[PDB]
A paper describes a structure:
Our data demonstrate that RbcX-II from the green algae C. reinhardtii functions as a bona fide Rubisco assembly chaperone, despite its considerable evolutionary distance from cyanobacterial and eukaryotic RbcX-I proteins. Like all other known RbcX proteins, CrRbcX-IIa is an arc-shaped dimer with a central hydrophobic cleft that binds the C-terminal sequence of the RbcL subunit. Conserved polar residues at the corners of RbcX make critical contacts to the N-domain of an adjacent RbcL, thereby stabilizing the RbcL anti-parallel dimer in a state competent for assembly to the RbcL8 core complex of Rubisco. The green algae Chlamydomonas reinhardtii contains two RbcX-II sequences (CrRbcX-IIa and CrRbcX-IIb, orthologs of AtRbcX-II) and no RbcX-I ortholog.
Taking advantage of the finding that the N-terminus of RbcX binds into the central cleft, we therefore generated a fusion construct between CrRbcX-IIa and the C-terminal recognition motif in CrRbcL. In this construct, residues 462–473 of CrRbcL (sequence WKEIKFEFDTID) are directly linked to residue Pro37 at the N-terminus of CrRbcX-IIa(37–156), with the new N-terminus of the fusion protein starting with Trp462 of the RbcL sequence. This fusion protein readily crystallized and the structure was solved at 1.97 Å resolution. Difference electron density along the hydrophobic cleft could be assigned to the RbcL residues 462–467 (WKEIKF). Residues 468–473 (EFDTID) of RbcL as well as residues 37–43 of CrRbcX-IIa were disordered. The sidechains of Ile465 and Phe467 point into hydrophobic pockets surrounded by Phe60/Arg64/Leu67/Leu92 and Leu57/Phe60/Met96, respectively. The sidechain of Lys463 points towards the C-terminal end of helix α2 and Asp90. The peptide is oriented more towards helix α2 in the cyanobacterial structure, whereas it assumes a deeper and more central position in the hydrophobic cleft of CrRbcX-IIa. Consistently, density for the bound peptide sequence is only discernible until the first Phe residue (Phe467) in the complex structure. The loop insertion between helices α1 and α2 of CrRbcX-IIa, which is ordered in the structure of the CrRbcL(462–474)-RbcX-IIa(37–156) fusion protein, would extend into a shallow groove of the RbcL dimer surface.
Residue numbers in the entry:
A (entry chain R): 462 to 467
B (entry chain B), C (entry chain A): 44 to 156
């Protein structure tokens, strides 16, 4: 459910 | 802090991040976490990825994770240390240097007459 | 981006930034920029440091500087390229690795019984 970005 | 120090601490946060991504994908079964334990670890990791990993190599974040899910923190720590031997440090410095020189050249060529 | 690519671009911006700081100090020198041109360079650089260093590696920022003050851009580019020979990547890589291992050890020790 998340676009995990740094 | 030196430029080298700054860069070190930033790399440490990158590695912690890479480790979280790796473990997240591992936990995601084929079509979802399968065990009650992997499910809990998956949900805790998802929750923790919604919170910033400060400018401290990700250690404050790791400590918080460890309080909530000690098994998950051990795996995250194992993966980020393992990644120290996978990360291509030579390539990294090589790209940073070559592309600095190449951008300088292109900028100067453009402005010259 | 690969993690190495991310790190490379970030190193590039760090070098552009270090270069700006170096040139700013040199322009100051003992008791003020000497030539009317260097005074102009000082003021432009101070202007440009009030703006975020856009572009991978600071290149968009560098191009804007070059349009306004080509002499300044040339110096900034020369210094960031020179800094590639001085930046201690080994030390950086060393610190990032050691401190990863040390933090893991302290975290695990702390949680153990």
């Amino acid at each position: 459910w998340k676009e995990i970005k740094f | 802090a030196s430029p080298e120090r700054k860069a070190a601490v930033a790399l440490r946060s990158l590695f912690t991040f890479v480790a979280a991504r790796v473990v997240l994908e591992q936990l995601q079964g084929p079509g979802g976490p399968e065990t009650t334990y992997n499910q809990q670890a998956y949900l805790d990791l998802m929750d923790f990825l919604g919170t910033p990993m400060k400018g401290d190599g990700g250690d404050e974040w790791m400590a918080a994770v460890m309080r909530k899910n000690h098994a998950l923190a051990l795996r995250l720590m194992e993966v980020r240390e393992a990644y120290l031997d996978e990360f291509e440090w030579g390539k990294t410095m090589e790209m940073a240097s070559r592309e600095t020189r190449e951008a300088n050249t292109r900028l100067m060529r453009a402005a010259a007459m």
